[PDB]
Design a protein around this ligand. Structure first.
Ligand code: CEF
Length: 260
């Protein structure tokens, strides 16, 4: 069965695997450790971007607001922000960079604009997500220490919130569509969930990786002839310097979408 296949995969991999699939045709679910907490790592960047999109529902000028990028703003991984040092980026551009390239400076600028990680958490709560918590900025939110509740959520909570953000009632239509455009244009996920799916399916996703070999992806999936699927795959390991394992996320995706 699917459950037996995921257990075997987890056992052989030497870690802890969390999966939540929602089939929006009938709201059926495939769950595996879906109520356990996992470190989100950069998958949290979806919530920071969405919180700024929510602000833009009531403030037409916001997304074109310019933010200065200085050398001191740069942290450990900033492929887009580094190209704009001593220039500006708009909040929309920062949203795009955080999601499509996982730029950590872009994330921190969004958080600073919102007023801190607690403001991202409050946004999640406003959507009915009582599980999500953001505690730190980038890159320290990727420490992924076993048992640490900081910067964690559960696979099921994240699947439900992602469904609400991209297909449901969380955002007004213009904003919903913008988030979906950004996720579809992700450049970092080729070897993760996408690699376990039919090539012709359309995928929007956000990856994240951190210490303890923590390797995550959250995705919305549009099949060619069926209703969308929402899939969260979280994976973490017991040793701090473990290799990341995008291949395990691809394998899990293949397992839970099979037959269909
Ligand atoms: C989000 O997860 C960001 N993760 C990191 O920066 C991690 N180190 O932070 C202390 C990290 C990246 S790889 C690894 N073994 N740890 C990254 N956003 C990711 C992502 O997978 O989406 C990368 C593109 C770069 S940074």
């Amino acid at each position: 069965s699917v459950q037996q296949q995921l257990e075997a995969l987890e056992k052989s991999s030497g870690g802890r695997l969390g999966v939540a699939l929602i089939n929006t045709a009938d709201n059926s679910q495939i769950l595996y450790r879906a109520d356990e907490r996992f470190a989100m790592c950069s998958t949290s960047k979806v919530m920071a971007a969405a919180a700024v999109l929510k602000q833009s529902e009531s403030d037409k000028h916001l997304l074109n607001q310019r933010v200065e990028i200085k050398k001191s703003d740069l942290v450990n991984y900033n492929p887009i922000a580094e190209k704009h040092v001593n220039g500006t980026m708009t909040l929309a551009e920062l949203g795009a960079a955080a999601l499509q390239y996982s730029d950590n400076t872009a994330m921190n600028k969004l958080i600073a604009h919102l007023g801190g990680p607690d403001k991202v958490t409050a946004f999640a709560r406003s959507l009915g997500d009582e599980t999500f918590r953001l505690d730190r900025t980038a890159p320290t939110l990727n420490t992924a220490i076993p048992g640490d509740p900081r910067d964690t959520t559960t696979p099921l909570a994240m699947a439900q919130t992602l469904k609400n953000l991209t297909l449901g009632k969380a955002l007004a239509e213009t904003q919903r569509a913008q988030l979906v455009t950004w996720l579809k244009g992700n450049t970092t996920g080729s070897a993760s969930i996408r690699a376990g799916l039919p090539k012709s399916w359309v995928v929007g996703d956000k990856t994240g990786s951190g210490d303890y070999g923590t390797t995550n992806d959250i995705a919305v999936i549009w099949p060619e002839n069926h209703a969308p699927l929402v899939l969260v795959t979280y994976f973490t390991q017991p040793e701090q310097k473990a290799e990341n394992r995008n291949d395990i996320l691809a394998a899990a995706a293949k397992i839970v979408t099979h037959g269909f």
